[PDB]
Amino acid sequence: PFPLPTGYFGIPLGLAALSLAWFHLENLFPAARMVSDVLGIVASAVWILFILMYAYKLRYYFEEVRAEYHSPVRFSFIALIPITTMLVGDILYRWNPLIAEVLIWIGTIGQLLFSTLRVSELWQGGVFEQKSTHPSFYLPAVAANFTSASSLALLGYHDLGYLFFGAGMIAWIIFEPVLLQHLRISSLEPQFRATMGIVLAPAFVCVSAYLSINHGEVDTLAKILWGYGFLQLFFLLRLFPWIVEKGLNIGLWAFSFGLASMANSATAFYHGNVLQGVSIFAFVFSNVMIGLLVLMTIYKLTKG
Amino acid sequence: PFPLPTGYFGIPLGLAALSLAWFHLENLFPAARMVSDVLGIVASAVWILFILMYAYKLRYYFEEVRAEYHSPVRFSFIALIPITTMLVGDILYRWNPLIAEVLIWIGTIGQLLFSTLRVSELWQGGVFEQKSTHPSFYLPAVAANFTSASSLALLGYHDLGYLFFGAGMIAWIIFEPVLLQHLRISSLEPQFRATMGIVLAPAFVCVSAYLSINHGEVDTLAKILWGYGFLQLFFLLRLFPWIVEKGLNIGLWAFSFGLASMANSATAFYHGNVLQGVSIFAFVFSNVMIGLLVLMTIYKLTKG
Amino acid sequence: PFPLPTGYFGIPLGLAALSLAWFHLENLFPAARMVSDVLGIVASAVWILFILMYAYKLRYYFEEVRAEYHSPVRFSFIALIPITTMLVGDILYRWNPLIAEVLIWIGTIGQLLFSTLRVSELWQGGVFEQKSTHPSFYLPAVAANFTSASSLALLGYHDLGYLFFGAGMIAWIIFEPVLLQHLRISSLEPQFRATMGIVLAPAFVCVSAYLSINHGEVDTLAKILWGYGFLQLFFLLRLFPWIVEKGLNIGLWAFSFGLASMANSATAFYHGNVLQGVSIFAFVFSNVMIGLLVLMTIYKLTKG
């Protein structure tokens, strides 16, 4: 018996997002569907297990959940739950649209309630401190809204999806300035550094959601978002030795959301015949990196 | 004899903006014109009175005006004067375009001169402090430019209106990051908390101005802005008990600008057959809230 | 023998940018080509000389270069080198596209390597301080990417140009919030104040690059960018007496990038029949100001 660390939801999140990326290649390359289905089944299975473990945590370790919830830093990871729930919904849609729709709405209402209760509460002051300014804040504030946007578009609710999209995009632009200034001034401690991987996510998750809503039209906004996304990738690549100064660890799954969304967006750029060479590199790169994450995770698992 | 607190201009501002919202419903529902005209006449009458009271303040309480002007916090409320002057111009345009145009230009030149003198002066440093980072800054920096944008569009100056629009939109995105970080860290004191209502304004005033310039075309930008606007609404609703911790007060008119612009934008979304259900809710909600403000103000007035 | 202060690259930068502005008037007014060619030849000659002087610095004053590189403030000026190299490439393209393309790629790879190594390294914390938050940061972070964007578009690489464009535009919006808050709180010391001129650059360099990529189409984004650009101009004009409190100096070339890009963008607005009166004013204003910079520089040179 142990309380499931909430961050572990990043594993099915990354796998689910990568399933969706491969799904979007099926009409260019049919074998991509089998790869998508396998990734989707594994992500869903891991999600079920982690959901049940989290239900156990709520039942028997409620004070740990309460403390994470009220923490001005640790609360953000709870947003992984409804995010992964929506992504699993998006996977399941290929097989059962009714069950998919239920999960998508549960995740959407859940993330919106979550932010509305906790993200706003921060504006009361005195609890959040300068040192609370962490990449994890992107999860409730930004990533959850993008995930809702694309999931609702999948269901046919394009205009409602644009509202969530806007909420996420503007929230992103409003938070990042203060995050990067904080990182410049204050050296994130090693135990939090893997969460630098979340810094990769905004531009790529943003363009993926946008392309999901706008029928895959690769337009000026999409190209703009990709450009900033690759800038951040190059920066994070340069920073990687510092990120893992104290060793490789499981927290590196933090990168998987950005990586998977880079792959997903790459499929749309390829479909649209925009920067196809860059698209192929992006898609291959993201898959290799997530493959390495899977292989390091199997290892850790075969070492208890 | 007393010096008129400059913040009181928020009352005719909210009423004038709400008049304009109803005005935009007239071709869907004719009776909306009577409601618009009544609101517009009351707003204009209150504006005349407050202008005369402010002329008296300048004549006999000039040092109080000087101190408010030089304050790195209190200067912002002076921007209410040219903002309300433009909105009254926009109302009067339905009856007398020549007088309307004069007021619109006086307000536009006045707000631009005001910002150019005072907002820039802050960049000299040493006067503005971290604790000066208040929602009121939106008034000179953001709301005034949006108001110019839409007023100039009304007069047929669409391209000039886009310049003001851009100034306001980029200024908004450049200020809000630091405002929300400050609110997270430092608990705004109760006496300033009603000004949290100004946080509702940017997205809604922005989309209202945009739709005024672009002939009511509800496009991707407009939907994006509405999404962030509703996020902030939900946050402020959650925060409302904290906002009024020390009691309901007249400062709550601070919400009326955002509310009225939510109503105005809702008329355009409805006209464009986008999210009509949300539009009706938004329009009804905003009217009820401003109706409550009017009823609390009549009360206060019937209690001296 | 002396080590060339890296900031001096701002002189050929401003002249090169102004050459390109005049170049864009040639099909409206043929005599503009002669003016462009003369400015372009002078900028290129000054650039060659400064490059050779900088090669000498690297060879015989390497520790001075190393210290500037590692400084969390002074590193930014090194970005002037690849920026000016690209602009000289853009000039030379009218005579020799092959040599132009080589310079453009050297400058593009060089600026991207430079940022990737140094701008990201800041996020390790503990070196950059709040007082490091200076306008010069725009050079590597923002201006270099815009310059790449427009130079690559010149070569026909529009989509790749949009990636650089996005990187610069989003980087701009993400840095400026914290810069203006810092300037409000902390009074930039006189010796750095001329660099306030760099604050003029982002919106104008941004719209110039955008118009270069999008075939000169003056659209809503372009008008938006111009509006914020003129707001900042008016602010900087008001601030000018404070900027030069301790006297006029050669650092005022800092303004030339924004001024030249105001002129360049003005040619496109004029071509597109948008705000032609404003365009003429902008173009004339920018030329007069840069003419004054040239005349003060000849003076200083005729006084050793």
Ligand SMILES: CCCCCCCCO[C@@H]1OC(CO)[C@@H](O)[C@H](O)[C@H]1O
């Ligand atoms: C992922 C879905 C998350 C839903 C979270 C439910 C939280 C309800 O719990 C609430 O937390 C608060 C907000 O800070 C409080 O102030 C409450 O009164 C408390 O009931």
Ligand SMILES: CCCCCCCCO[C@@H]1OC(CO)[C@@H](O)[C@H](O)[C@H]1O
């Ligand atoms: C709403 C219209 C407002 C116009 C305000 C006029 C202010 C003119 O007053 C000016 O204020 C300054 C700027 O900080 C000064 O430095 C001046 O010299 C002073 O004359």
Ligand SMILES: CCCCCCCCO[C@@H]1OC(CO)[C@@H](O)[C@H](O)[C@H]1O
């Ligand atoms: C304008 C083109 C600039 C290229 C700059 C080359 C810099 C290479 O120098 C590098 O600087 C670093 C990054 O901070 C280091 O950590 C290195 O190991 C060092 O080799």
Ligand SMILES: CCCCCCCCO[C@@H]1O[C@H](CO)[C@@H](O)[C@H](O)[C@H]1O
């Ligand atoms: C995954 C969703 C996490 C929900 C975290 C719940 C936050 C609990 O919030 C708590 O709820 C209480 C009693 O149940 C109140 O007594 C509290 O004081 C409050 O701390």
Ligand SMILES: CCCCCCCCO[C@@H]1O[C@H](CO)[C@@H](O)[C@H](O)[C@H]1O
């Ligand atoms: C950070 C946000 C960047 C927003 C970029 C928006 C770019 C709008 O790009 C659009 O391109 C289309 C091509 O015909 C046309 O609609 C217009 O040229 C333009 O509005």
Ligand SMILES: CCCCCCCCO[C@@H]1O[C@H](CO)[C@@H](O)[C@H](O)[C@H]1O
């Ligand atoms: C998002 C990236 C997924 C795209 C992977 C495409 C790999 C195929 O590669 C491409 O195949 C072609 C036709 O099918 C060719 O004409 C090519 O030149 C070749 O590069």
Ligand SMILES: CCCCCCCCO[C@@H]1O[C@H](CO)[C@@H](O)[C@H](O)[C@H]1O
């Ligand atoms: C509504 C517009 C408010 C204008 C506020 C005016 C700010 C006054 O600015 C003052 O003007 C002076 C004398 O008149 C100078 O002597 C000052 O030192 C300066 O404080």
Ligand SMILES: CCCCCCCCO[C@@H]1O[C@H](CO)[C@@H](O)[C@H](O)[C@H]1O
């Ligand atoms: C924070 C700013 C968000 C800017 C969003 C701009 C969205 C541009 O949306 C536009 O949609 C039109 C539909 O055909 C086309 O012009 C293009 O797809 C696109 O440029």
Ligand SMILES: CCCCCCCCO[C@@H]1O[C@H](CO)[C@@H](O)[C@H](O)[C@H]1O
């Ligand atoms: C901005 C919100 C103002 C719109 C208010 C519209 C209220 C009318 O309500 C609508 O009337 C119709 C036709 O007129 C119908 O067909 C509807 O189903 C009904 O909802």
Ligand SMILES: CCCCCCCCO[C@@H]1O[C@H](CO)[C@@H](O)[C@H](O)[C@H]1O
């Ligand atoms: C114009 C490009 C400027 C390059 C600045 C080079 C930064 C040098 O970086 C230095 O390089 C070294 C040795 O050569 C290492 O020994 C160092 O410790 C490192 O400081």
Ligand SMILES: CCCCCCCCO[C@@H]1O[C@H](CO)[C@@H](O)[C@H](O)[C@H]1O
């Ligand atoms: C800070 C960023 C501002 C982005 C502004 C984007 C404006 C998009 O403007 C575009 O105008 C065109 C006119 O038909 C159409 O494509 C749409 O109306 C709209 O998408």
Ligand SMILES: CCCCCCCCO[C@@H]1O[C@H](CO)[C@@H](O)[C@H](O)[C@H]1O
């Ligand atoms: C970017 C600004 C450069 C444009 C400079 C244009 C100066 C010419 O000026 C214009 O010339 C015309 C025809 O050529 C006229 O019809 C005009 O009314 C006149 O203003």
